[PDB]
Each structure stands twice: as structure tokens, then as C-alpha cells.
Ligand binder design. Structure first.
Ligand code: ACP
Ligand code: ACP
Ligand code: UEG
Ligand code: PXL
Lengths: 268, 269
């Protein structure tokens, strides 16, 4: 069985905890062949840590996509896309590929970006992985505060064409346990682990969606892939570490090097 | 203890076998925290595999470097640099950092002002310099090298130009029954050998080699132990390389941890 080829269409996080860096590291950890088409470069100021986003030109974006498409990805993830034009093209390359899996991490103002996502990505998404704020934006419900709110959003997001939806609650929701809500159109599943240290969590969302993608490419069902991704990212969070006064990234290699973490799944 | 922070200063190999892709993968495999400052983006034509190098703006290269230096690398590798400006800046950020280790992979293929720039700015700061047979000929001024004796000569010259340790890769380019690399520490030459493995799918082997050397140094191996371990690491990767298309196929970066170790024969020559 040859390595599964997994493409991420994503920006570079120079601090190397999130972004295409989280993606390639997680793809490597999960025994897939990681590839990236880069969309922008994010840098941070040495004194204040203020972020700056440098876009890449569309000409180089297209050249990267031609190369990736000729290689033929088995699975595609999207992360930071940044423009409507990019969001659009991302969906197209999935369709143009022979990929069977598309994981849209809807990283988020111009609500135009959000409408593009709804319009071009959701209908193609094998799984869409919003955080609590992003699920409120995609659903139109605004602030979500509870599992029941998460159910409503997931329902709206499924109706918008995503075949499977995972709304991450985590630290944004409850503080005692870490709750996410998975929906496949017929059943709501609550996914749960212990709530680990909250200080050093940079890169968890990116790592969750990259894992989901790898687990899918390697033949897990969308439901089993999201359960496995949460266990994978949970270890990474538990083993997060302090980079400097501003940031502490998850340890993407922790699941394999340090420990597994249990995930409890219940129908809600 | 904490994960070692390892920075590569390198281009993106869209095909993902070499470049910063091989570096981050290798770094991940070797239990370090991998980081990149991007210098350029390399793409390939879908029908011919002809490469195209799109430079990144110096303004973004410098901002990436500020971020990385602020984080504080333990070890820095250089890959595709592309210009004398970036070459110079790569050496300058190493000295500004508290990194103990600088591994310069003098990439010239997959502007020989660059060669001279590497010689002036990078060799004197290098813990280890890792040229392939072709790059060793360029850096030494000897031209084409075809033997262990020519490699020793190149190694001495490169060492005299300031590189603290030198490994000249022979491998398939030496065109012998086994894969020989030559290590020199200014005192003694060591020949490193593994079998020759399949030749068709080796893309990324050089970048991988130098990445593993970097991560091994960061994790506390001596320069000689680090390049010996790197050869064993990339040997497995090469042995388990696979066919990407009719043009190229990459090494399997994860083969050393996932598939097999390959013993490296070490002889003082
Ligand atoms: N401290 C913690 N303990 C356990 N699980 C956590 C956690 N923090 C977040 N999670 C979980 O991590 C995954 C990612 O969550 P989410 O996307 O909300 O985090 P995030 O936005 O803070 C990280 P990123 O820096 O890439 O954006 C989800 O599975 C969520 O349950
Ligand atoms: N077919 C093969 N079998 C065994 N060892 C090989 C090999 N090809 C290269 N090597 C070894 O791999 C390491 C990398 O060698 P070198 O830098 O010359 O690779 P390369 O130029 O062939 C790949 P790239 O340029 O695409 O990154 C060296 O240790 C060399 O001995
Ligand atoms: C070429 O494949 C290559 C190398 C060494 O071959 C190094 N870096 C990058 C970006 C490449 O594309
Ligand atoms: C490149 C890139 N992509 C995604 C994210 C957020 O998950 C970040 C930072 O949080 C980033 O820098």
C-alpha cells in the first residue's frame, strides 16, 4: 500500500505550530505523503508578536496547484485561503482531481469570504471543521453557547451541503471537559476528552483538521476519522509547550511519541 | 527536556520530496520542532517536469527571519537560498542567534556568484557542509570528482575555506557498486558506506540527508555521529522510495522509523 498523497491548500505560520506547518507535520505523523500549495505567509513582530499576512500572487498559487494536481492527491484539506478567488479555486481543484476526500477547515471582516465558503466549499466538503465562532458565522446564528445551539448550527451547516460537520467547542464552550459535536445528517454525536492545560494550544484546530484528513485518506470513516483526530490533537494539546511569552504550540508528535488519549462518544 | 527548535532556511519544493518539505518532515521524524523561513517557491510543469523558481520578496524573507530568530533556534540548516543577499543574511542570522549548530547544504541543482557567496559567507560559519559530488567540485574549484582520492582533495580544500566538518556525498554520482560518502574533520578521512539501492526514485535524498544531520546535532550527537546517523536515515528513505510519475519519485522520509534501519559501514581511509 503506497503512501496516501494528502494536499493542504494553506498559508505558512512562521511560528510553525499552525498552518501548513501543522498540516505537513501531522500528515507525516500519520504516515501519509504530505504536500502543500501555499497561499500566504504569516509573520509576527519580535517585540509585540503582532501578526502580518503577506499574500502570494495568484500566478504562483496556480503554478503550485498545477504541480499538485498532476501528482494526484488522494485527499485535500483547506486551511487559510484569504480571498474569494482562492476559496473558489480550492473547490475547483478538488473537483478536478481524483481525490475522494475534501476537509474544509473554515479558518476565519468581509462576510464575502464567508459566503464564498458556503457557496464553493461546503457543498463539496466531506467534513467541515468549524470552531464555535466559525459555526456561528457559517450558520448565521451568531454566538453559540451550548450543545443544543451546536446542534442547530450543525443542522444548518449540513443543510448547506456539508456531508459531515464537526463543531468544535473545546475551551470556547466548557472548561471541565472538551466537547465537540459531530453530525452526519441522521445522528448527533458528542465527542469528549479531558480538558487539558489551556495555556499552550496554538495549532490545535489546524492539527485537528489535518489529522481528520489523513485518517480519512488512510481509510477511516468520517465518524472514525474525527474521533481519531480528536484523540490525536488531545495528546498534542496535553503536551503543548511554551515557545515565548505570546505563544505555545501543541506537540504534533505527542500521540505517537508520548501517549494516546481516550475520546468518549455519546449520542445527543 | 524541551523539543529542540530547528530552523531551515529554504525554498518550497511543491512536489514535496525535497526542499523545506523534506526538512520539516525529517525534523518531525526526528523529534525536533521544525521551522522554516521560505526563500522561494519551486514548481514543475505538468508535461515536462521542468522547474520554475519564483523568488519571494526580500521584505517577507526578512520578516520570516525576525520571527524565527525571536523564537531562538537551537540549530539552523540552509537549503536553497537563491541569491547572494539571502546567502549573506543566512550567515548573519546564524551568528545573531544562540544556535550552536549551522548545517549548510550547498544546493546548486535538484549563478556561480552564489558559489562564491557560499564560500565567503557560509563555509566559515558551517558546523557541517554537505555537498553532493557536483557541488564539492564547484566549491573546491577542482571541477569533476570521480574517486575517493578526488573527494579527499575536495574535502581538504573545503575544510581550509573554513567549514568545521565536511561530508562529500558520492552515492550514485560516483557510479560504483556501493554508496560511498566521504567525511573529513580536518584530521582524518572516514568513508561511509551502504549498499546502492534502486536509482529511479531518490528525489529529496540530499535535502533529507542534511536535515537529519541538523536534527541529530541538535539532539546531542557529535558531527561525525550525526552524519553517520543521517546516512542510515536517508538510506532507508531511498530504499523505500516510490514512483510519483514518469519523471520523479521521492524518498520515503519516514522509512527509518516506520520500515527499517540500514547499517552504515564506517572505515578510516
Ligand atoms: N485545552 C484543551 N483540552 C482538550 N481539548 C481541547 C483544548 N483546546 C481545544 N481543544 C480541542 O482541540 C480541537 C481544536 O479546537 P479549536 O479549533 O476550538 O482550537 P484553537 O482555535 O484554540 C487552535 P488554532 O491555533 O490552530 O486555531 C477540538 O477538538 C477541541 O475540542
Ligand atoms: N541510489 C542510492 N542508493 C544508496 N544511497 C544513495 C543513492 N543515491 C544517493 N545516495 C546517498 O544519499 C545521500 C544523498 O546523496 P546526494 O545528495 O548525492 O543525493 P541526490 O542528489 O542523489 C538527491 P536530491 O538532489 O534530489 O535532494 C548520500 O548519503 C548518498 O550516498
Ligand atoms: C530541488 O529539488 C530542490 C532542492 C535540492 O534538490 C532544494 N530545495 C528546493 C526548494 C528544491 O526544489
Ligand atoms: C497560516 C495559518 N493558518 C491557520 C491559522 C489558524 O488556525 C493560523 C494562525 O492561527 C495561521 O497562521
Amino acid at each position: 500500500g503506497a503512501l496516501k498523497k494528502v494536499l493542504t491548500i494553506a498559508g505558512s505560520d512562521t511560528s510553525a505550530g499552525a498552518g501548513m506547518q501543522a498540516d505537513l507535520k501531522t500528515f507525516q505523523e500519520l504516515d501519509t505523503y504530505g504536500m502543500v500549495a501555499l497561499t500566504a505567509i504569516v509573520t509576527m513582530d519580535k517585540d509585540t508578536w503582532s501578526h502580518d499576512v503577506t499574500p502570494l500572487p495568484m500566478d504562483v498559487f496556480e503554478k503550485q496547484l498545477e504541480t499538485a494536481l498532476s501528482i494526484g492527491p488522494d485527499a485535500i484539506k483547506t486551511g487559510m485561503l484569504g480571498t474569494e478567488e482562492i476559496i473558489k479555486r480550492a473547490g475547483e481543484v478538488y473537483e478536478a482531481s481524483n481525490a475522494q476526500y475534501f476537509v474544509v477547515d473554515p479558518v476565519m471582516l468581509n462576510p464575502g469570504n464567508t459566503e464564498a465558503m458556503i457557496k464553493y466549499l461546503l457543498p463539496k466538503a466531506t467534513v467541515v471543521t468549524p470552531n464555535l465562532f466559525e459555526a456561528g458565522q457559517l450558520s448565521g446564528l451568531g454566538k453559540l453557547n451550548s450543545i443544543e445551539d451546536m446542534k442547530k448550527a450543525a443542522t444548518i451547516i449540513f443543510d448547506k451541503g456539508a456531508q459531515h460537520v464537526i463543531i468544535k467547542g473545546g475551551k470556547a464552550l466548557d472548561q471541565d471537559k472538551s466537547y465537540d459535536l459531530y453530525y452526519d445528517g441522521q445522528t448527533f454525536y458528542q465527542l469528549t476528552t479531558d480538558m487539558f492545560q489551556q495555556s499552550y494550544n496554538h495549532g490545535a484546530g489546524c492539527t485537528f483538521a489535518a489529522a481528520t484528513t489523513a485518517y480519512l485518506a488512510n481509510g477511516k470513516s468520517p465518524k472514525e476519522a474525527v474521533i481519531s483526530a480528536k484523540a490525536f490533537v488531545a495528546s498534542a494539546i496535553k503536551n503543548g509547550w511554551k515557545m515565548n511569552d505570546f505563544v505555545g504550540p501543541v506537540d504534533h508528535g505527542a500521540y505517537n511519541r508520548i501517549e494516546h488519549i481516550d475520546v468518549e462518544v455519546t449520542e445527543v
